[PDB]
């Protein structure tokens, strides 16, 4: 899939708002993927064990991997389609060593665009949700193939 100008510049306007707050879209972000889908939490040997929504928004380790995530997720988006080469250390560590099936990254793709809605319903409408959501999904493909590349496809 190839995403115009005008779809880009939809999601990197209102990426440009997320990144006035890194940390608290991360937490935002994290913590509605663990809610709505409790088995993701699981994945997280570190995080695990945290029991309640309170437990996960005092929790700074979360924060700062929330912060992770979206900064390495944010370079991905700025360039535009021609991501290969950051897609491949992130392909590697999610299909080898931490073993995230693709459907995860559908709801945690869902999770983002539910945190954007909320957050910023004036530069998320419609059209830049459509932009979004077009822009996760040609990620997912392209992590989707590389997976297979590497031998897991999940
Ligand atoms: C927008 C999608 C995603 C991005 C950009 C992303 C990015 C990252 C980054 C940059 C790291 C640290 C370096 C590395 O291990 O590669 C990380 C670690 C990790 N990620 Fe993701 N991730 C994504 C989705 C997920 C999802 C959906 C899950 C699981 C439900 C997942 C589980 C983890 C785990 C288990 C770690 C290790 C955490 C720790 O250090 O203990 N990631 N991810």
Redesign the pocket.
């Known amino acids: 899939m190839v995403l115009s100008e005008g779809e880009w510049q939809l999601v990197l306007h209102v990426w440009a708002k997320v990144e006035a707050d890194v940390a608290g879209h991360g937490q935002d972000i994290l913590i509605r993927?663990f809610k709505s889908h409790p088995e993701?939490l699981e994945?997280?040997?570190?995080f695990k064990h945290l029991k309640t929504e309170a437990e996960m928004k005092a929790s700074e380790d979360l924060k700062k991997?929330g912060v992770?995530?979206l900064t390495?997720?944010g370079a991905?988006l700025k360039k535009k389609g021609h991501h290969e080469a950051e897609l491949k250390?992130?392909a590697q560590?999610?299909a080898t060593?931490?073993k995230?099936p693709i459907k995860?990254?559908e709801?945690?793709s869902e999770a983002i665009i539910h945190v954007l809605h909320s957050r910023h319903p004036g530069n998320f409408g419609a059209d830049a949700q459509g932009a979004m959501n077009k822009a996760l999904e040609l990620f997912r493909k392209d992590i989707a193939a590389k997976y297979k590349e590497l031998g897991y496809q999940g």
């Open positions: 993927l993701t994945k997280f040997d570190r991997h992770t995530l390495a997720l991905i250390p992130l560590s999610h060593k931490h995230i995860y990254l709801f945690i």
